[PDB]
């Protein structure tokens, strides 16, 4: 995945 | 009136009536908005005047607001400002050959377009090029993506450039599982709370910013 996950 | 939720300014030139109808339809069908939900825009037929557009059971109605500082719907009731005209018609209904009391303002979803951190045309490679010339963690920009209603926050963290996808989902914006009213609200939240690890959005990056706090070539 090219984009970071935000939680 | 400029910072009011309901003031949309110039929409689009003469396509503003259709844009206002679309904006009201989108807000009203999405949120289950009541009749009288409205916005004010610059008139495209009567230059210098304003147009009040409001919701009426699935149909959008438009009313001319004369600006001579004298603001008015009817030659009988004149106001000093647009705020006073709107506030008065939120408590007392306006009449036509139906009666309508103004209710909830339809806010703008596009206030980000004037922000120093926003780029309407910027590639993933283009953002990485600009951010590699700013040797500060927390340097960031927001760029429009190729999908409609999609954006990316490009930021500098741990010496590298990372990207986050932001989706405009109707009348709100989503960043993972977090929800905000708008892209401006999302960015203002992540300037005070970490977006990635302990990194907050600290340094808004545009061309003006690069000549001041940037290097000539990337790292």
Numbering used by the authors:
A (entry chain C): 479 to 485
B (entry chain A): 545 to 556, 558 to 613, 619 to 647, 649 to 770
Per the authors:
Kaposi Sarcoma-associated herpesvirus (KSHV) causes three human malignancies, Kaposi Sarcoma (KS), Primary Effusion Lymphoma (PEL) and the plasma cell variant of multicentric Castleman’s Disease (MCD), as well as an inflammatory cytokine syndrome (KICS). Its non-structural membrane protein, pK15, is among a limited set of viral proteins expressed in KSHV-infected KS tumor cells. Following its phosphorylation by Src family tyrosine kinases, pK15 recruits phospholipase C gamma 1 (PLCγ1) to activate downstream signaling cascades such as the MEK/ERK, NFkB and PI3K pathway, and thereby contributes to the increased proliferation and migration as well as the spindle cell morphology of KSHV-infected endothelial cells. PLCγ1 is a member of the phospholipase C family, which includes several enzymes that hydrolyze phosphatidylinositol 4,5-biphosphate (PIP2) to two important second messengers, inositol 1,4,5-triphosphate (IP3) and diacylglycerol (DAG). Activation of PLCγ1 occurs due to the intramolecular binding of the phosphorylated Y783 to the cSH2 domain, which leads to conformational changes in the protein and the release of the cSH2 domain from the catalytic core of PLCγ1, thus rendering the latter accessible to the substrate PIP2.
We reasoned that the linker region separating the PLCγ1 cSH2 and SH3 domains could have interfered with the binding of the pK15 12mer peptide to the PLCγ1 cSH2 domain, since the former contains tyrosine residue 783, which is known to interact with the PLCγ1 cSH2 domain. We therefore expressed and purified a truncated PLCγ1 tSH2 domain (PLCγ1 aa 545–772), which lacks this linker segment. We obtained diffraction quality crystals of this truncated tSH2 domain in complex with the 12mer phosphorylated pK15 peptide. The structure was determined by the molecular replacement method and refined to a resolution of 2.1Å. In the PLCγ1 cSH2 domain the pK15 peptide straddles the triple ß-sheet that divides the two pockets of the SH2 domain. Its phosphorylated tyrosine residue (pK15 Y481) is in contact with PLCγ1 R675 and R694 in the first of these two pockets, while its hydrophobic residues V484 and L485 in the canonical pK15 SH2-binding site (YEEVL) are in proximity to the second pocket that is known to accommodate hydrophobic residues. The pK15 peptide adopts a similar position to that of residues 781–790 in the PLCγ1 linker peptide containing phosphorylated Y783, which connects the PLCγ1 tSH2 and SH3 domains. The unphosphorylated Y783 sidechain in the cSH2-SH3 linker segment is oriented away from the phosphotyrosine-binding pocket of the cSH2 domain, while the phosphorylated Y783 sidechain superposes well with the K15Y481 side chain. We therefore propose that, following phosphorylation of pK15 on Y481, the last 12 amino acids of the pK15 cytoplasmic domain engage the PLCγ1 cSH2 domain in a manner similar to the PLCγ1 tSH2-SH3 domain linker, once the latter has been phosphorylated on Y783 by the activating receptor tyrosine kinase.
